[PDB]
Amino acid sequence: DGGITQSPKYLFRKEGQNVTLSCEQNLNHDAMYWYRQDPGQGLRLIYYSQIVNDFQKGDIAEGYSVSREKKESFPLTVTSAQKNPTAFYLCASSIGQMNEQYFGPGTRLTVLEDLKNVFPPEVAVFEPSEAEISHTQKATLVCLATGFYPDHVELSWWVNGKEVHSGVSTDPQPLKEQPALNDSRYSLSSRLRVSATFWQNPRNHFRCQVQFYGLSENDEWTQDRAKPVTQIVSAEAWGRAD
Amino acid sequence: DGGITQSPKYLFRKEGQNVTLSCEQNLNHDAMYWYRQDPGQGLRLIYYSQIVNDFQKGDIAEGYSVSREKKESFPLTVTSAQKNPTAFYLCASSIGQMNEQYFGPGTRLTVLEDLKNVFPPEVAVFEPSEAEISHTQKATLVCLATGFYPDHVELSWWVNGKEVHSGVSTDPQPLKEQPALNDSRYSLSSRLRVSATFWQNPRNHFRCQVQFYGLSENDEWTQDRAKPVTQIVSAEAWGRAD
């Protein structure tokens, strides 16, 4: 119903490369902000703008630039000058002064030179065990997303075409398949629990969807394998009558 | 949250085939209903159930069967005996008697024997014209879904990973590519309008997603081409700096 739109949840920034994070809002607010979340002090202001064409620096505006040609947009540019390892950027807007700030979904900008390590995930769904069915009258589908790097994914479940939340339990964070190594790829899993009777209808459909935030179409790909571009990887299953 | 969950928005039913439409609710209601919408009298009651194991027929309960083993579910079965061309089925629940009915999203059950005509859609996205950009400072992406049958689709737009609504204009209904013929396949289009500055950021991503409701994994496929199973077909584009 009209909120804030910013850059995708995850982005790649090659060292010494200039990247711009969009941020637009249709709330007709005048005040727009850009924050960076640093492990210690949490959220910290980068740039702030009270009206068109104006911007007041924050304590960490070093290496960043913004513009405010229009009331709706406040694009933040992270220049090669910036030297942060990887951060989380958050955009916001408010009526102005000190009324009330509304926040965007945030964006994690991961900085890395090497690009040969990037891999989209492989996804699978495993049907519930008859044992589970005939003992709790519930059915639990399991989704496994594996072999991806970096950990730039978002998992969701779709039942009969619509996204669902109740009965969904997803790991809080992707885990390294080999914590030992460093060039380790990641895995992530989730469970969807539904009634047994629902799972037993052959017409019901279940889909596990994993959004991978990879390379852009502009990025150059040297390797031979398809470029790990942003994409959707899914796995599905139909209901099975015992 | 909490509501009603029924069968998918669209379903196929081969003539002389038995199909069951699920309907479950976690509102702990006791009264559950099943309606059929016929072009003349609008919504009409098929079956009704006041408590577990009980069901009172409606004026058109001919050809249908229901069960009420549990309080949460009221599955409607459309038997081969049923001879309706194609209808819209709607599930509902209420505290009971005549308190207040809550409705499911409904399901259109399309009846057809020519399963040789079922085809998923092909999807494309067309970039905005520079003319449009440098004249209105707006950018309009266009999505075209073509060659599908039957008209069992749902289209949505995804910007930077999240589904969007503002700036979206989709045709009210899919249209036959050849109204003349009968075995005509369908097409559907939609537009997404965004600011020009937003479209000019190479890091922004735009995806057109079309959910096709096709055959189940259980359904037998005689043809040679891949079976037109339920699936997601997408087309995407990245922002382009003029």
Q: What is the DSSP string of A101-158?
A: EEE---EEEEE-S--TT-B--EEEEEPPPHHHHHHHSEEEEEEEEEEEBSS-EEEEEE
Do A101 and A128 lie in one domain? The reply is: no
Do A102 and A123 lie in one domain? The reply is: no
Question: Pick from A113, A140, A163: which residue ends a domain?
Answer: A113
Distance between CA atoms of B11 and A150, rounded to whole angstroms?
A: 39
Do B119 and B94 lie in one domain? The reply is: no
Q: Using alpha carbons only, how large is chain A's radius of gyration in Å?
A: 21
B24 touches chain A (CB under 8 A): yes
B4 to each of B25, B88, B141, how far by Cα in Å? 5, 16, 35
The HSE-up count of residue A42 (CA atoms within 13 Å, CB side) is 0
Do B139 and B237 lie in one domain? The reply is: yes
Residues of A in contact with B19 (CB under 8 A): 203
Do B98 and B7 lie in one domain? The reply is: yes
Residues of A in contact with B22 (CB under 8 A): 197-198, 201, 203-204
Do B241 and B125 lie in one domain? The reply is: yes
Do B73 and B151 lie in one domain? The reply is: no
Do A123 and A97 lie in one domain? The reply is: no
The CA-based diameter of chain A, rounded to the nearest angstrom, is 66
Q: To the nearest whole angstrom, how far is the Cα of B180 from the nearest Cα of chain A?
A: 31
B162 touches chain A (CB under 8 A): yes
Q: Answer yes or no: are the C-beta atoms of B88 and B8 closer than 8 Å.
A: no
Do B65 and B161 lie in one domain? The reply is: no
Do you know the residue count of chain B? 242
A122-155 burial, b at 16+ Cβ within 10 Å, e below that, comes to ebebebbeeebbeeeebbbbebbbbebbbbbbbb
Number of domains into which chain A is organized:
2
The residue segments making up the domain with residue B73 are: 1-113
Token pair, residue A176, equals: 């390294």
Residues of B in contact with A197 (CB under 8 A): 22, 24, 69-70, 73, 75
Distance between CA atoms of A29 and B48, rounded to whole angstroms?
A: 51
Question: Pick from B46, B81, B113: which residue ends a domain?
Answer: B113
Residues of A in contact with B166 (CB under 8 A): 2, 26
* Elucidated via: X-ray
Distance between CA atoms of B193 and A155, rounded to whole angstroms?
A: 27
Do A52 and A11 lie in one domain? The reply is: yes
CA nearest to A203 within chain B: B216
Distance between CA atoms of B35 and B55, rounded to whole angstroms?
A: 14
Four-residue CA torsion sign, A148, B235, B105, B177: negative
The HSE-up count of residue A60 (CA atoms within 13 Å, CB side) is 18
Token pair, residue B169, equals: 């204009």
CA B195-B201-B205 angle, to 5 degrees, is 85
**Scanning the structure block, which residue is given the tokens 């609710």?**
B25
Question: Is-cis flag, bond preceding A172, omega within 30?
Answer: no
Subunit contact A22:B216, Cβ cutoff 8 A: no
Do A97 and A123 lie in one domain? The reply is: no
**Scanning the structure block, which residue is given the tokens 């911007």?**
A55
Question: Pick from B75, B90, B113: which residue ends a domain?
Answer: B113
The angstrom resolution of this structure is 2.7
CA B42-B190-B163 angle, to 5 degrees, is 90
A20 touches chain B (CB under 8 A): yes
Q: Answer yes or no: are the C-beta atoms of A192 and A209 closer than 8 Å.
A: no
A78 to each of A20, A61, A82, A87, B225, how far by Cα in Å? 6, 10, 6, 11, 49
Which CATH number belongs to the domain containing residue B152 in this structure? 2.60.40.10
Token pair, residue A98, equals: 């000190």
Do the strands B107-111 and B10-13 form a parallel or antiparallel pair, or are they unpaired?
A: parallel
Token pair, residue A6, equals: 């910013």
The residues, any chain, with a CB within 8 Å of residue A231's CB and separated by 6 or more, are A120, A212, A214
The residues, any chain, with a CB within 8 Å of residue B34's CB and separated by 6 or more, are B23, B45, B46, B47, B48, B58, B64, B66, B74, B76, B89, B90, B91, B92
Distance between CA atoms of B49 and B34, rounded to whole angstroms?
A: 9
B21 touches chain A (CB under 8 A): yes
Q: Answer yes or no: are the C-beta atoms of B168 and B155 closer than 8 Å.
A: no
Residues of A in contact with B203 (CB under 8 A): 7-8, 11, 19-22, 216
DSSP structure class, residue A197 = H
Four-residue CA torsion sign, B77, A157, B144, B217: negative
Q: What secondary structure, in 3-state letters, does A54-111 show? A: CCEECCCCCCEEECCCCCCECCEEECCCCCCCEEEEEEEEECCCCCCEEECCCEEEEE
**What is the distance of C-alpha A16 from the center of its chain?**
23
Q: Answer yes or no: are the C-beta atoms of A155 and A189 closer than 8 Å.
A: no
CA nearest to A198 within chain B: B22
Distance between CA atoms of A65 and B26, rounded to whole angstroms?
A: 51
A203 to each of A166, B111, B242, how far by Cα in Å? 20, 15, 47
CA nearest to A106 within chain B: B160
The CA-based diameter of chain B, rounded to the nearest angstrom, is 66
Do A86 and A122 lie in one domain? The reply is: no
Distance between CA atoms of B191 and B165, rounded to whole angstroms?
A: 11
Distance between CA atoms of A178 and A155, rounded to whole angstroms?
A: 21
Distance between CA atoms of A194 and B24, rounded to whole angstroms?
A: 11
